[model samples]
Target: VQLSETPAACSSNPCGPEAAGTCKETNSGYICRCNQGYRISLDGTGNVTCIVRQESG
Candidate 1:
């Protein structure tokens, strides 16, 4: 016998206006990480924002 299972809703890439962050599928749903040259906001907004990377000397 064979069986199949449905995928998670996060596979649809449901990014909205505030979806300017990294995304990945998880057991529960999905998660967002800071994009390249950006970092997750630590001011309580909990958002991803672009930033300049310091070049190695």
Candidate 2:
């Protein structure tokens, strides 16, 4: 029942939102080093997500 054993999640970017998002693989887990206007946020579990900036001030 085991398949490809899931290649590095960073390989395909579990970060979600692309555009200007960057990720790094770590023993603990992966993280997103987003670009301008983008902020890093955790998606509940561990896979962090880079969200777009929505200035409402």
Candidate 3:
């Protein structure tokens, strides 16, 4: 995972404790993107924070 001052500074495979995807620097905060087989949670502000779901139980 690439650590940057802002989320926008992130790029592909942008992983972190939050497991965020593509990131973008926003006025209020950073913007993260979600890819296939993944979705966003309301725990954070915007898409900046992403979460992956388990496939098999």
Candidate 4:
């Protein structure tokens, strides 16, 4: 993972308003934070990125 070779870039984000609500890193990919009242997931095939939750209003 790039994180292992680039610790500086993989540093944790500040716990501020902009911080991801929740996330996790994997050997070949990473997950993004899914905020409260929201959800997240991989939106497409061959896609390994996390995205915000989508719900019908």
Candidate 5:
């Protein structure tokens, strides 16, 4: 099977939580992609949490 073979509705919002909680829906699934240093958890649980990028001094 191919990625595009999946249906749109079959996709789910991986963005568990966030301020805007915006997600870009894909064929098989959706992903959390927004500004303010927000992204899906790398734990593979698809938990959308806040991420703070600290600058190096």
Candidate 6:
């Protein structure tokens, strides 16, 4: 039998299809290093996502 802990967050690849960035394990959870043009955003539900940066006039 296995303990079945948190289950290595970045074992496979969650950000591959979600954020399209590099993923790394963190104390909190999987942290995705978003691309240069994108910014990280976390919702109240704890969902991680990357948003495109807006243009400045």
Best by TM-score: 2
Look at candidate 5 and tell me the lDDT of residue 7: 34
- Give the alpha carbon lDDT tens digit for every residue of 1-57 in model 4: 235655331344311123324445655444455465344444455333333345421
Candidate 2 per-residue lDDT over residues 1-57, each given as its tens digit: 112655475665665556646777667667677777777777788557777665321
Residue pairs in candidate 3 whose N, alpha carbon or C atoms collide under 3 angstroms: 8-24, 8-25, 32-48
Q: Estimate each model's TM-score.
A: 0.30, 0.58, 0.45, 0.32, 0.36, 0.49
Candidate 4 has which clashing residue pairs, if any? 22-33, 39-53
Q: For model 3, what is the error of residue 42's alpha carbon versus the real structure, in angstroms, after optimal superposition?
A: 2.8
RMSD in Å for all candidates: 8.7, 5.8, 5.8, 6.6, 7.9, 6.6
Q: Candidate 3 lDDT, tens digit per residue, 1-57? A: 346643344543233444435565567555656655556565544334567754311
RMSD of 2: 5.8
The lDDT leader among the candidates is 2
- As a TM-score, model 5 comes out at 0.36
Per-candidate Cα lDDT values, in order, are: 0.40, 0.63, 0.50, 0.39, 0.44, 0.56
- Evaluate residue 18 in candidate 3 and report its C-alpha lDDT on the 0 to 100 scale: 43
Better model by lDDT: candidate 5 vs candidate 6: 6
lDDT of 2 at 45: 80
Question: Between prediction 2 and prediction 4, which has the larger lDDT?
Answer: 2
TM-score between model 4 and native: 0.32
Cα lDDT tens digits, model 6, 1-57, are 112653476554444444445667778777877676666666555566555555211
Off by over 4 Å in 5: 1-13, 18-20, 45-57
Name the lDDT of candidate 6. 0.56
Model 1 TM-score is: 0.30
lDDT of predicted model 2: 0.63
